[PDB]
Amino acid sequence: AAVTSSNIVLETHESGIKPYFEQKIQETELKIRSKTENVRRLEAQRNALND
Amino acid sequence: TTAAPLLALLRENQDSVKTYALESINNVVDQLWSEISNELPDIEALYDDDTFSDREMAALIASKVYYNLGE
Amino acid sequence: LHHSEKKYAEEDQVQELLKVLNEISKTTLTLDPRYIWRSLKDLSSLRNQELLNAETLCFTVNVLYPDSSSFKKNLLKFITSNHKSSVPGSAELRNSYPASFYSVNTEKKTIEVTAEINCFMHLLVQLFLWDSKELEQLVEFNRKVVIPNLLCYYNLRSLNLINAKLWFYIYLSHETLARSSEEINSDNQNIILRSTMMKFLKIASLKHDNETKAMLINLILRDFLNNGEVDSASDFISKLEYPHTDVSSSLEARYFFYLSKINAIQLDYSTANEYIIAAIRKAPHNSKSLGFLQQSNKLHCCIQLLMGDIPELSFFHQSNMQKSLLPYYHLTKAVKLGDLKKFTSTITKYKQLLLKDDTYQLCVRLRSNVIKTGIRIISLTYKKISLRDICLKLNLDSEQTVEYMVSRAIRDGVIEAKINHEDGFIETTELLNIYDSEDPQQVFDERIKFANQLHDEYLVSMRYPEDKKTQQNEK
Amino acid sequence: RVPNYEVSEKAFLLTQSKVSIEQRKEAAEFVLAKIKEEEMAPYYKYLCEEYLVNNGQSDLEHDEKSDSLNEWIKFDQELYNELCKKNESKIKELNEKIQKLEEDDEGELEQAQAWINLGEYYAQIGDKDNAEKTLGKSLSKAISTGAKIDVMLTIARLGFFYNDQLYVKEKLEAVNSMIEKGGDWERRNRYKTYYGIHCLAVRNFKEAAKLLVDSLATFTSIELTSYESIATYASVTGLFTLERTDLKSKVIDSPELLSLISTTAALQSISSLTISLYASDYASYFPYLLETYANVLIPCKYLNRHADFFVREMRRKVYAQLLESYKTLSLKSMASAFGVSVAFLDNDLGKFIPNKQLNCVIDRVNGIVETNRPDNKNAQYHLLVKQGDGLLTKLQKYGAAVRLT
Amino acid sequence: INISNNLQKALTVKTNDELMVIYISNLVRSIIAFDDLIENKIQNKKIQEQ
Amino acid sequence: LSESDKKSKLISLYLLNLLSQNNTTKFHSELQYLDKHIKNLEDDSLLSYPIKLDRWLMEGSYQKAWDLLQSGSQNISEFDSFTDILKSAIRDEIAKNTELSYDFLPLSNIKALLFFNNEKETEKFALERNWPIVNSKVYFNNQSKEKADYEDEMMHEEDQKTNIIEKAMDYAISIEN
Amino acid sequence: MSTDVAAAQAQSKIDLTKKKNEEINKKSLEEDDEFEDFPIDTWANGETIKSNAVTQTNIWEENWDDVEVDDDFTNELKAELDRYKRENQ
Amino acid sequence: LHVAVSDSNDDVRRAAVIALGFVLLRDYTTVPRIVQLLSKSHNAHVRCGTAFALGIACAGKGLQSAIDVLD
Amino acid sequence: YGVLDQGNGWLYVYETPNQDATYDSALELVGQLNKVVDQLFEKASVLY
Amino acid sequence: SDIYFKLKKLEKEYELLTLQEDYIKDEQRHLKRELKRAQEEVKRIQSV
């Protein structure tokens, strides 16, 4: 609201293990995209050197 | 409207207004936090004096401000 | 006639959305699923308006709603009731297949994925009433639909993307009523409005969803400019948290245009000027940002004068319009000669225009800089010039009056000069050769660092199209 | 066609307020006659409107203002009688050509030639509107490729005459496509003159130096300005583009400028200036500037539009020759040489100091005029960075674009 | 250091080339990859019919 | 309503309060609010008085501004209570400007410029800005030396410069990365 | 349209059915067109010709002393006579 | 993995590859990726030692993926 | 490669103004490479 | 939550991908030094 929490009340800040679930799952899904694309990048270059 | 009424109550040197300042601020700690950050040092000051019972309140409020910024 | 046309129109609308719901739920690729909605919004509205706008009402019933239905019906009544023209079997068909919404989710009602579909629907009605214009209650009705959709359908990154358009129009509809007139409704609701969007912003931080964070930021910043409570806008920009990963180029202009205004009222005109050139660079233009781009040019010229070094007369001719920049061409000239009377005549003349554009406050300081930039041509032209000669030129009271004006300007750095009082002349200081100094090494450092960053970036972006295509359905 | 230049140039003297009072009245009589002979009344209706609120204005079609300095040129009832008559006559002429050649002979080839002849007349009588229509009819139907090039040049002449450069621009694109397709080198010389005049009117002068001198080699005067004009234009363009060192080699020594020598007042004034600037006599220079204002800028239509631009340019140009060849000289010394007052000189140098085309600064205290010109290591540094800054901005935007998509 | 700046800029255009070749490679590979699948369905279809 | 006659005096005295503290930043923010509020609608509440001082500081004429303070203490709206402060505030501001302008001055010249009625005040003000008053001339350059040393002792000034050993090595490792 | 023109903004970030909606969002948040605020409000438009290549929005380059009047013909004329008066005094 | 690169005696290079497979018996489907670069390595001993590793890791119950790397 | 002093009657004479022989080449370098980038940008962006 | 406790073991698996990513840089360096070594032999043959 503007004096009480009364929006986004169905997740986040409900019990502490609740925001633990949310923070981490969003971090993991971003991370796996980064780690695969970098590993692919970096292998294209090492194949070029090998070549 | 700004948080400007809320900040002013803390600075007032009468002890009854200092207690009162935190009662209002406490409600809107999560809603305004980019306009209640000027007199965050006023809130850390009240902890130091043991003559306040609002040591508890001062920490409670204080921690939450840091998270809202994303620290 | 009517019964057929609406029938086919409702069922097509459901199907197009259901696919972009699916599209976003398959890994992360934020920008492309979004872009589908932006191209779609424009078209969906024009199709609903032809053949009576109760083509939206068929769609509105063919979603699970919290209280959208009542608000939509009222418009139909007003242009003469169209609820006997859009009738069941052609306004309510769940069928036994999904292409007018899946039957299994609708009956069960706890697996339903109606959410984003529902967000796109609301937006359509809000837009039609926005064109027409309605205020006060219009803000209330919008505000009443929007909050329920956060709360009956669980939040995802995917949800925040499409409800990022919902936020824009509430916020916008309240600001236009606010600038119309103050009102008992406006003072009170401003408090809620300012706070609720600040509350989503940290939740957006937690999500790591960069598109969402930018849109909430831009909206808060704008309210401060409109009512002049820029004592806040300053505190807002002490912090930085604006992302640039999933933020669109159109938005990056948006941040920089308003940021440029706040910097001008802390009286630091160096980083104001930086962000206004910057704002144009990010900005695309076609015809649909034509208003924004016009004001971008106007703001740049105000800033350049504040610093104390004139823009050219050619500078406005070589802009590809001068057809609203005709006041600020007059402002370059009036500061430029060191003439006070010309400044008075134009500022009174164009008073309504200056007031609207938030450039009237800067012109109280630019009254002050008539004389300060008046000095700047004369000290530049003549390396050594007596105190008395400058009293001639700019019609100044006393020799001592000269010394005071110039001394301020050189702490602010505008002249770059030194006054000698034992030989009774002002000597404009040299720049020398800086080729033999360590200054070019600073410039290069900027260039080197940016170029290294481009070589690393391209290699990452080889990979990204390849992922997009592989996911995409055969061609 | 050929009469357009002579008519418009004389007519432009009455429009101008800044010319000599006797030359203007003598001029009014000549131009007025040309109207009577050929029935140029539609472009005299055009001339009337361009006068409005100037001196030299005498007319009875519209109103006559209190500003006047001619009374020797007016509209007449007689002027309208010749208009009604001649127009009617023209109609009857063109009708026989059209009927007879379509029917009897070949429709395509012969009529199109008949329509080039019509389009000649329309230029003669000062109708642009009908001239372009029938000459477009000539391109449509069959005719030789060389004639398609000539007809196009004809349409292009009409934009100088009425005096709008936008009109001219459109036509010369077409001329440039077919000049190299047929590959006619005779008709190219003609193209160099038209694009040269068009350049003289507009902001550009740089290229117009090349173009104009090479049209002095080979010239056709049929449907083109006087030679005396080209020679005079050619000199001024030389000043704008070239440094003083190469003035003498490339414009003054050109032998097709010294075949005519001088043969009008306008060539004499400009010729006296050019040489005295190289010769490093600035005593006669400032007096010859006054002459060039009088005879080259104001009468000439295309240069009365860079009447201000000329003043700025040629003061800058003089100042540029001393200030690379002098360091810490008096203002006083410079005024007595120049033959100008001191007070005007202080003010003229300060026009260009803020724009940095002198890069020079002036002690008022002792009258010393200092020189701080770049030409050193620092100068190479400034050029290199302006390029490498532009390259960077381009790399930033383009890279970022490719990356999003 | 100035010459080292121009050398660096040059290498920005070089890596900006490699990107392009890949971006061209990506459109050609994606079209032919998909074409094959379509072309196989027809093949299978002959077998089924009798 | 929410209106008082006393309203007018508070807006005007509040603008002067910021200015003397050198929150000219806040002065410019605070103005925007009040222009929409009453400057457009009720015209003047005696708002011209602060705005005019601001103009003359930004213009850089301290004669005009000092003159208005002298008159403002010959007037009461409670501007008398803020003139003393804005006298002291102007004096500190001109010392900053006048380091770059002069290398030295007679003690009678510094006296005229930074506005003072005793030579005890002018030299007190000089030795605050660490400028010897020896020879009966000031020496502005002397404070400039000591500010530069203060900066060199800190480690915030050494890496801002960026040395040439550092620039090359950081340049080398991006490439080899 | 200032330093960094309208052409570079259409060629760098390409106008697409994708981008137009976003651009609408820029215009709307600012509120309205301010291209159309001036010719309705003022019932006037920008600069017009004075000799051609001096004023009026064009791809013609201009002067920096365009606004300054041509009295220069007079001033050189007066300069000669006045100079004889001082020297020969 | 660092060891296979860091020594130049090629018996050791071989050994490191072999040894990884035993460590990664939990993982069955990660192992074809770790040694994907090591088949395309130029040194005969890194190549030798790849085959053992994939062999140990997915021993018993077949796997399509592992065999494709070994071809 | 001189300038003339009229302020006391002297002639200051210097040899050629010294300049970066290197920086001449580096203007030409930028001019070459710059058109390469227009082609890169055209061709990579007419794909989509 | 079930997914979340299965996660813990997945996150370890992604960490070995992280270590592959650090391992590429170490292979790269070895090859680059060596390309110049391979080239040195061929210069021996080019010359006398």
Curated annotation (Swiss-Prot), chain A:
N-acetylated by NAT1. It is found in: Cytoplasm; Nucleus. It comes from the Eukaryota. Signal peptide: none annotated. Transmembrane segments: none annotated. The 26S proteasome is involved in the ATP-dependent degradation of ubiquitinated proteins. The regulatory (or ATPase) complex confers ATP dependency and substrate specificity to the 26S complex. Present with 4700 molecules/cell in log phase SD medium. Belongs to the AAA ATPase family. May form a homodimer or a heterodimer with a related family member. Interacts with OLA1, TMA17, and UBR1. This is 26S proteasome regulatory subunit 8 homolog. It comes from Saccharomyces cerevisiae (strain ATCC 204508 / S288c). The lineage of its organism: Eukaryota, Fungi, Dikarya, Ascomycota, Saccharomycotina. The chain holds residues 3 to 53 of 405 of the full protein.
Curated annotation (Swiss-Prot), chain B:
N-acetylated by NAT1. It comes from the Eukaryota. Interacts with UBR1. Present with 4750 molecules/cell in log phase SD medium. Acts as a regulatory subunit of the 26S proteasome which is involved in the ATP-dependent degradation of ubiquitinated proteins. Belongs to the proteasome subunit S1 family. This is 26S proteasome regulatory subunit RPN2. The gene is RPN2.
UniProtKB/Swiss-Prot annotation, chain C:
N-acetylated by NAT1. One of its GO terms (cellular component) is proteasome complex. Residues 463-475 have a biased composition (Basic and acidic residues). Residues 253-433 form the PCI domain. Keywords: Acetylation, Phosphoprotein, Proteasome. One of its GO terms (molecular function) is enzyme regulator activity. GO terms for biological process: proteasome-mediated ubiquitin-dependent protein catabolic process; regulation of protein catabolic process; ubiquitin-dependent protein catabolic process. The modification Phosphoserine is found at residue 437. This is 26S proteasome regulatory subunit RPN3. The gene is RPN3.
Curated annotation (Swiss-Prot), chain G:
GO terms for molecular function: molecular adaptor activity; protein folding chaperone. Part of the 26S proteasome. Associates with the nuclear pore complex (NPC)-associated TREX-2 complex and the COP9 signalosome. Interacts with CSN12 and THP3. GO terms for cellular component: cytosol; proteasome complex; proteasome regulatory particle, lid subcomplex; proteasome storage granule; transcription export complex 2. Belongs to the DSS1/SEM1 family. Versatile protein that might stabilize multiple protein complexes involved in diverse pathways. Subunit of the 26S proteasome which plays a role in ubiquitin-dependent proteolysis. Also associates with the TREX-2 complex that is required for transcription-coupled mRNA export, and the COP9 signalosome, which is involved in deneddylation. Keywords: Acetylation, Phosphoprotein, Proteasome, Transcription. Pfam families: DSS1_SEM1. It comes from Saccharomyces cerevisiae (strain ATCC 204508 / S288c) (Baker's yeast). Disruption phenotype: Impairs mRNA export and transcription elongation, and induces strong transcription-associated hyperrecombination phenotypes. The keyword 4Fe-4S does not apply. The modification N-acetylserine is found at residue 2. Present with 5590 molecules/cell in log phase SD medium. It comes from the Eukaryota. This is 26S proteasome complex subunit SEM1. InterPro entries: DSS1_SEM1. The modification Phosphoserine is found at residue 12. The keyword Transcription applies.
